[PDB]
Each structure stands twice: as structure tokens, then as C-alpha cells.
């Protein structure tokens, strides 16, 4: 089952990465950032430029070649919307263990076709599309997140919102807790990784001592996560979970940027998600600026800070 690929989310210092769309504007800039961060970016693909050299690294026409020649176990996609679904499929077919798709704007119907293939295999784990990526601070950065705000630590972060991911990271760096692993699952309605996927990794990871879950209006993934936490994160040794759900004041019936962010037919509202998470013991920060302080205090109440 595709759930067997969940472990591939936990990138580390040994993860070698290729960049699909390597020579494009954003693929170039964020590849530069990844190299400066110390990430083992070893090459990239751009159909028609195989054999060339870019940022001092080899360029390949296909993922299959790039994987065989470089030993990469992860790929990140900076391919424009008309072709990005095909780029994801190429990475799945090449059995890349982890694929991160940054691209915003892939047709929903395209992603339905990608998900169809994705769910019928388990060599490849997809994060995204329309997401910032995944980062293991100080070990492996795959995506667009600003490197300098991270600090290796104890909080696992999963968020549908890229920018709110950065807020959670910054706040948990500020209060000294740091981050174990940070996954932006993106704002699209059809994607490769949901809250439960990341929550499984977090609850089983000893380095993750607390969790921040950031959601928003639309869908029912937060409600599913609430039930998952009810059954797997109750009792004595539970890990504190803090959450913020964006859109409490959003107008109904409007797509709020993310196509996945809409209140339609009375479903997808923020208050229902907040209540579901609260019923599971999650502490919901009403302010998005207080995620760090809220989880710090939950660590304090449980005497989890060794001052």
C-alpha cells in the first residue's frame, strides 16, 4: 500500500536530490539556496539540455538517467503547470523514493490522474503539489523555505499553508524548541501527502516531542487527523499537539487563493475543524502569531523543558 512510502518523508543528511526544472528561473535560484544550505543536490533534469552543466552539476534529459548516474533518492519539481503532472509521473515511474512538487496551478484533473498512479504503487512518496517542500533542519532542505529561520529541534510541523509553515518554524526557533521535521503538504485539493501521513511519522519519531498542525478552510483532512490523534495519541505518553486553523473570518463560498480553501455547501468551515481537533485533545492557538508560545507552555505544563 502507498502508506508504506510514508517513511520516505524523513529526509536526512544522506539524502541526495535532483531538481526537475533545474535550469529554470526558480529551479536555479532555489537550487543555489539548497547548495548554500549544505543539501546534497547532485543534478537535475531539463528535457533537451541533457549533457550540459548547471551550477557545477550535471543536467540530464530524464529522471531515470539522473537517478542512475547520481544515486539520487529524492526529486524536487520546479516545472510549469502544463507539464508538472507529467514530471511527477516520470519521477514515480523512475521509482524515486521521495518527490516534492512545488508547482502551483496544476489542473485538478491532471492531479487526479497522478494520484491514480501514485496510490497503486509504493516506491514513491509525493509531497505536494503547490507546497513549499520538506526540511530536516541542518541536514536536508528540499524546497523554497528560507533556510535561515530553522533550528534543529523537537517540534514536528505539518501545514497546508507554505507561509504559515515559515511562521511556525520561526516561532518555534524563537522560543528555543526548534524543529525535527517540517512538511508543507500544500494547498491543493488533490496531493500526495495528508496530515495523517505526517502525523504517523511524527508520533513514531523519538526526535519529535511535540507537533504543530496548521490547517485552513476546505476539505476534511483536519477532521480525519483529529480522529487519528484520538486513537493514536491519547493516554499518558501522548505528544502535545498545537494547531492553528486559518479562515475563521473568511467569507463563505469564496476560494481563498488555494483552490482547496473554500467553504461550500456548509462544509469546510474552520470552526468545525477547531472543535474536532479540540475534542481530540489538541490545543488550538486562536492567534497564528502564538503557535510557538502556545506549544512552549504545553511543554512547560508537562515539565518537558529541562531548564
Amino acid at each position: 500500500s502507498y502508506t508504506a512510502s510514508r517513511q520516505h518523508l524523513y529526509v536526512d543528511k544522506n539524502t541526495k536530490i535532483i531538481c526537475q526544472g533545474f535550469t529554470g528561473k526558480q529551479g536555479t535560484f532555489h537550487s543555489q539556496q539548497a547548495l548554500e544550505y549544505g543539501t546534497k543536490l547532485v543534478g537535475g533534469t531539463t528535457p533537451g539540455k541533457g549533457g550540459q552543466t548547471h551550477l557545477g552539476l550535471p543536467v540530464f534529459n530524464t529522471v531515470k538517467e539522473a537517478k542512475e548516474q547520481t544515486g539520487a533518492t529524492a526529486s524536487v519539481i520546479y516545472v510549469p503547470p502544463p507539464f508538472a503532472a507529467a514530471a511527477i509521473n516520470e519521477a514515480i515511474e523512475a521509482e524515486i523514493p521521495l518527490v516534492v512538487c512545488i508547482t502551483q496551478g496544476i489542473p485538478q484533473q491532471d492531479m487526479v490522474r497522478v494520484k491514480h498512479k501514485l496510490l497503486r504503487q509504493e516506491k514513491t512518496r509525493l509531497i505536494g503539489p503547490n507546497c513549499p517542500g520538506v526540511i530536516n533542519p541542518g541536514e536536508c532542505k528540499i524546497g523554497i523555505m528560507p533556510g535561515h529561520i530553522h533550528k534543529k529541534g523537537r517540534i514536528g510541523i505539518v501545514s497546508r499553508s507554505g507561509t504559515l509553515t515559515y511562521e511556525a518554524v520561526h516561532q518555534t526557533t524563537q522560543v528555543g524548541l526548534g524543529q525535527s521535521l517540517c512538511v508543507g503538504i500544500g494547498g491543493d485539493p488533490f496531493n500526495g501527502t495528508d496530515f495523517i501521513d505526517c502525523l504517523e511519522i511524527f508520533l513514531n519519531d523519538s526526535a519529535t516531542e511535540g507537533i504543530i498542525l496548521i490547517g485552513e478552510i476546505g476539505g476534511n483532512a483536519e477532521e480525519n487527523a483529529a480522529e487519528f490523534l484520538k486513537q493514536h495519541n491519547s493516554g499518558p505518553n501522548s505528544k502535545p499537539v498545537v494547531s492553528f486553523i486559518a479562515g475563521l473570518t473568511a467569507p463563505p463560498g469564496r476560494r481563498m487563493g488555494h483552490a482547496g480553501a473554500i467553504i461550500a455547501g456548509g462544509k469546510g468551515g474552520a470552526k468545525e475543524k477547531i472543535s474536532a481537533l479540540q475534542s481530540a485533545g489538541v490545543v488550538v492557538s486562536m492567534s497564528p502569531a502564538q503557535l510557538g508560545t502556545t506549544i512552549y507552555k504545553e511543554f512547560e505544563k508537562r515539565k518537558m523543558l529541562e531548564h
Binding site: 503547470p81 485538478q108 491514480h116 496510490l119 513549499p132 507554505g162 485552513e216 467569507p251 487563493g257
Partner: protein
Amino acid sequence: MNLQEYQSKKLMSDNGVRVQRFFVADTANEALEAAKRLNAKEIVLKAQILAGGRGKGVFNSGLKGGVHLTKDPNVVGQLAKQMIGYNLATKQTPKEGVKVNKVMVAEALDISRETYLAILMDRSCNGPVLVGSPQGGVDIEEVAASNPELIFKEQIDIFEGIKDSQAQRMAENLGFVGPLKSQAADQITKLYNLFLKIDATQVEVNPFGETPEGQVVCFDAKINFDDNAEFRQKDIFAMDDKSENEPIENEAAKYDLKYIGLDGNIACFVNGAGLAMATCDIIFLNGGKPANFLDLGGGVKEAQVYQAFKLLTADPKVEAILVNIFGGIVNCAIIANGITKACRELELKVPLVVRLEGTNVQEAQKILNNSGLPITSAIDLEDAAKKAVASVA
């Protein structure tokens, strides 16, 4: 994206979906001739506006109602003269109403049975789902709350396509019997293939009905389109009717900007849909009212930033501007350059609170520090919200 009734019904008809035979008219005389050319026992005349409630609307010509039935083509023309060129206002338009430039003239058909039939991309089901109920003519949300056992669904495999067995089963669950069942199943199939062809997120028919004469007809329908597929749906998006949209939102769209106007007085200039929603939330939390939602997307060009900022400075209600950028793919320096360029021409008679963090934040702060502009700096999101609310209180 929005399509007039006559545009969507044409799209459905051109793809095999049975709708009421109809013509569209720009003049009362065209309405009269269309009525006579129909050669129909009874006729329906329908004002073409996007908002709902056309039936209970009122024109500034005195005519009550945007939908009229009659057997006489002469009445169709008499009524159309009071519609074309006039403003139709309903319970869902501004008080000034919407100018009606076109009317539909369609064959009126008796409805012996109403059902609900829709096709949508279902997030929970990871693909297209047929949704149907024999209880037609009412909001499906009500049927779901009153009689969930009457909501029937079929999950369609995106590669296999809809199977006859699925179309037949849904047709039966909707109460279609005998030859009407084969008719309904064929229409369900054509609706599904249309849904895929046009990159719809939803095609909703209500009522999906029978006539006394034994025809299955899509009497009314709403199509929601996937904006991400515009690049491969140029012909359909060309038909987009922006005449009833909020005007600032229309301007933003010209530059690929996602702007949603609100009722407050604190403008918001943010990157990311989540941070943008969260900024509205935190302003409310701290005693303010946001004037808009605004999501500056991924790779911003200075020109887009410049135009986006001007969209905030030209809303009469705006009494303060909150800039909150946490840049990853968004380059903070591009934001700074666009804002300062806009402020050089504006005048800026309102407080400007600026929170910048992330990609290239140092260069960005330098630009703002060299600008000579009256900027209130904020260190974090709560600080920015408190300073914004205080600046207009």
C-alpha cells in the same frame, strides 16, 4: 469564471446534453422572431444575468420578474422590450441591478418529475464522483441533512471512464424507469464526458427532469470551472462574464492577482493564501476589521507588486495598510521595490505597517530604509496587527 445561462446551455447542447431548445436575442424584435421560429406550444423568456433570483427580480422599467411563460410570441416581444437595455435587480444583485443585454427564448416544457444530478471532483474520493438524488428541485445540502439516504453516489475511475453499469444504476436510483432509464443513463454519460472535456470541478443539473412526453432534459445547470486549466480552455475562458464581479477584484485579475474585498478599513498585503487568511483572522482578533484578502503568489514581478499595492491605495474605505510578507519563493526585495515605486506616485495619507521576513529580507529592509517613506515597522505578526489596528483607532 462565470458563464451566462445561454453560454452554458449552448456548451452542454453542443456536447450532446439535452436542454430546452432556445435562441438568444439582443432586441425585442429578435425575441419575437425567435419565439415564432421556435414553433413551440409554450415559451419561456429569461433575462440573461449571472445572479440568482431572476424570477422575483424587478426591472427599472417596472417589469416584475426575469422569467416569463407564455404561449404567444407577441407577448414574448412585448415583455422583452421591457428587459433589453434595462437593469434587473434581485435579492442577489446590488440595488442598482444588472443591465440585461440579452434574453433567452426557449421552448417551455412541462416537468413531470424532478431529480438532482451532479458530477464533481471529490477530494475525499480522490477523483470524479456522480452525485444524484430523486429529490429534485431543492438545494442538495438540505436533502443531505433531511434525507441522506436519498443521496446516491458513484465513484468514477479517471482512466476507465464512466461505465454503462454506473450510469444505469444512477438512472435507476433517480427513479427513471424503462426507456426513460436508458435516456437518463445516456445523458449522465454525456454529462460526465462534458465535465472532463471542459476541466470542470463540478457540473450540477437541478432539475434533471422528465417531461410528460417522455424526454429526459437538463432544465437548469451550473458549471464550476478549474481556473488552473485556463491555459487549455482558452475558448471557454474567453466567454468569461465579469460584469457582475467586484470591480477591484476584476482589476487584480488583470495582473494574475487574487484579491477579495471585505468590509473593513485595514488593507492587507500578504503572500500566501494561508498567511492572508491568518492576517484577516489576527486583525479581527485584535479589534480591527480587514478591508481585503490578498494573496501575492509565488514568483512575483515588481510590476505586479506595484499594481497590487495601488489596488489597496485606491479603495475609499482603506484607512491603513498592513504589509506582511514571509518570503520563500517570494523575494522580499521585489516586494520592497514595488511598494516604494507605488508610494512615489500616490501621496500616502494613511499609516503603513510593514512586516518583512524570509528570502532576501536584508536587501528588502535596506530598500525600505532608504526610501524616505513613513513606515511603521513591525517585528512579528501580532505586533503588525496591533500596530495596524491602533493606527486607525
